Structures are given as C-alpha cells and as structure tokens.
Amino acid sequence: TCPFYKKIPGTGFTVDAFQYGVVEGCTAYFLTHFHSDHYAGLSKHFTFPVYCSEITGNLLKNKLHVQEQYIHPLPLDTECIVNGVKVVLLDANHCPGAVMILFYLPNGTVILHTGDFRADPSMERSLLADQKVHMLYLDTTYCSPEYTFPSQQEVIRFAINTAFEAVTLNPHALVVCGTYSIGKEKVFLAIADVLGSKVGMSQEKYKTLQCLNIPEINSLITTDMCSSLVHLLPMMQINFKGLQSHLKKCGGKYNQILAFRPTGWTHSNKFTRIADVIPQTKGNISIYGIPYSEHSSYLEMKRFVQWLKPQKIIPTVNVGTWKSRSTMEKYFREWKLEAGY
C-alpha cells in the first residue's frame, strides 16, 4: 500500500510508485529515473500514463516494452501543464535521464521532489532560484557527516591515469569496468577516449546505451570484444574467478586485466584519499575499487538545503527504522539553526 512519501497532496500524482498495482486516485504516475528500485512493476501491460524525461522514455519503450501511447516524455527546464497542474523537470545530476520534479499546486504551494540526486551549485541557477519551496522530498541516501567522498571529476582523473599508465607499460593489457544499471558511464567512456578505443560490451548493454541521446555514440561502442581494449562486464563478474574466465574467453589477446569497481561509499573513505588508492592483486589481474557516488555527500546535501530554505523536509531514503528517521531529523534541525531560516 503506497507510502505517504510517494504521494503529492492535492493532486492525482505519485512519484516512483509502480509496485502497488493501481493506486487509489492516481491519474498520473511520475518516474524520476530508470533504476529498478524506482521503476519496479512497470511492464508492457501498464495502461496508466507515465510522465518522465525523454531518455527515461526511450528506455521504457525499448527495454521494458511499454506502449508508446502511455509514455509521456517532457523536456527539461520547460513549464509544462499536466492534468491542470504546472510541472517542471530539472536535471538531477544522477544517471542518464534522471530528473527532479517541481510541482506548482492550485492552492499556491510549491513542491520539489529530488528523486535520486547529487546536489551541485549549478542547480542554484535553474528555475528553482525564482521562487519559494514549501515542501522538499529529499534523497537522504548519505545523510550523515561521516559520508564524505571526492568529486566525480577527481575520480575520473584517477581512473584515466591509472588506465593509460598500465596500458602504455603493457599494450596487451585489458581494462575492465563493472556495471549493473545506467549511471557511471562517464567512468568507462572517459577511459576509452584516452585509450583511443571503443568500449566492448554485450548486446543488451549495447542497446541500453543506444537509448541515452549520447552524441556520436556509434563511434564509441561495440559488441566486438576482440576490437576493443576497454570492456564492460556485470559487477557480479568482477572478481578473480570471473576475471580469469573472462581472460580465458578472449582467445589469447590479453595477458593482463586492470579492473575498476565503482562502489558508492565504503568505510575506507574515512581514512584513505583518492590519489592514495591501491588494488587487490592475484597474479596478472588487478581489481581497483573507486568511490564514484551518484548521490549527494553530507556537505553537498546540507549546502543545497541551506540555500533552498524549504519550510518542510520529507526524507525518501533510510526511513524504515526509527533510529534512521530520528538521526536525520536532528541534522535538519542543526542546519536550520546554523542558517536562521
């Protein structure tokens, strides 16, 4: 039974609520991004309207086989009317197609739902600048001061250098990046760019990238594993057993695998820095783990909310225990105190 924090009051609208069959008095179902915890339950047999970004639509059509008549893509940064309610979609800085949704209620209330996001200062020069926000539905994934991590740019720097270095030393070495959903594509395509390679992957994952409105994408990707010195494999498969077998599969074309595992936060973030990282080596294979987050750090989130100054905050992650909920409320109170609003 759809929880309260997936419902927008005084509309027929839910957000990311496809796993409760039909929802009591929902004219329109919004989807913030194409990640399975958020789209769970969508199928070819979905007959209610779905509102989403262009890229999330491409994905629903081609991957889930949702019928064209039910997919309502909207452009970003554009005032759109939907069932007599003004909405706007903002870039979320999460994965391809991911959006934040501004709802302008008939009664004059204004609601921001962030879906999944990584807050950034460039958001403060959007249509959010222009007016007051009464309720914030907040991605609270890393809402705790321990969670610091480096900028996406820093991590992609580290990844490129490690890749180039290892391949220049040994031009029979293969680079492997682990994946399970969209997002984290800048890791593997930035590596492939420096190397002068296309990225080799399965046909399923090849299809998925074809959905993403990437300029020139056909020059960048391939299924031909043999003509390709950066490869994508399921994250499940990024270990010595699964790497060995993969190195066996390439038919004597590579003597060495350098791999990256894009993990979110991990406890080693509290002690070690990004330039000071080391891999786990078992023979000719080396497996790095890098902290590429697609969610706000504690500080990023704090600064975003102190700038936005909402009247009320509703968390959408870590809400299932009273300890989590209790700890988050305290931090929100402190932020308000620190600022005065």
- For 86, 137, 315, the CA distances from 264, given in Å and listed in that order, are 35, 22, 20
Rounded to 5°, the CA angle 130-132-134 comes to: 150
128-148: b (≥16 Cβ within 10 Å) or e: beeeebebbbbbbbbbeeebe
Closest C-alpha among 13, 36, 16 to residue 25: 13
Give dist(CA 275, CA 259) in Å, integer: 17
Matching residue, tokens 């391939």: 222
Query: Shortest approach of Ni ion to residue 250 CB, angstroms?
Result: 32
Least distance in Å: CB of 117 to Ni ion? 9
Smallest gap, in angstroms, from Cβ of residue 208 to Ni ion?
Answer: 15
Q: Is 29 left (phi over 0), alpha (psi -120 to 50) or beta?
A: beta
Region of 7-15, 41-49, 115-123, 143-151 interacting with Ni ion (CB under 5 A): 115-123
From the list 27-35, 101-109, 215-223, 332-340, the region that binds Ni ion by CB under 5 A is 27-35
Binding-site size, Ni ion (CB under 5 A):
2
Q: Are 100 and 113 in contact (CB under 8 A)?
A: yes
Q: Which is nearer to Ni ion, 5 or 104 (CB)?
A: 5
- Determine the interface stretch with Ni ion among 49-57, 116-124, 244-252, 267-275 (rule: CB under 5 A): 116-124
Instruction: At 203, list the tokens.
Output: 């046909």
**Applying CB under 5 A, which part among 109-117, 151-159, 271-279, 302-310 lies near Ni ion?**
109-117
Stretch near Ni ion under the rule CB under 5 A, chosen from 32-40, 63-71, 192-200, 222-230: 32-40
Min separation Cβ 16 and Ni ion, Å: 10
Tell me how far, at minimum, the Cβ of 94 lies from Ni ion, in Å.
Answer: 6
Closer to Ni ion by Cβ: residue 179 or 228? 179
CB distance 257 to 286 below 8 Å: yes
Q: Which stretch binds Ni ion (CB under 5 A): 31-39, 57-65, 72-80, 150-158?
A: 31-39
Least distance from C-beta 277 to Ni ion, angstroms?
Answer: 24
The CA distance from 169 to 34, in Å, is 39
Kindly state the smallest distance separating residue 79's Cβ from Ni ion, in Å.
26
SS3 5: helix
Report if residue 246 touches Ni ion, rule: CB under 5 A: no
**Which of 183, 200 has the CB closer to Ni ion?**
183
116 belongs to the binding site for Ni ion (CB under 5 A) = yes
Inter-residue long-range contacts of 332-340, CB under 8 Å, 24+ positions, other chains counted: 332/305, 335/302, 335/305, 335/306, 338/306, 339/306, 339/309
DSSP state of 142: T
Q: Do 44 and 85 contact (CB within 8 A), yes or no?
A: no
7 binds Ni ion, rule: CB under 5 A: no
Q: Smallest gap, in angstroms, from Cβ of residue 295 to Ni ion?
A: 8
Q: Residue with the closest Cβ to Ni ion?
A: 116
- Asked whether position 113 contacts Ni ion by CB under 5 A, the answer is no
| Residue 35 makes contact with Ni ion by CB under 5 A | yes
Q: Which is nearer to Ni ion, 36 or 69 (CB)?
A: 36
For the chain, first and last CA: distance in Å? 35
Binding site for Ni ion (CB under 5 A): 35, 116
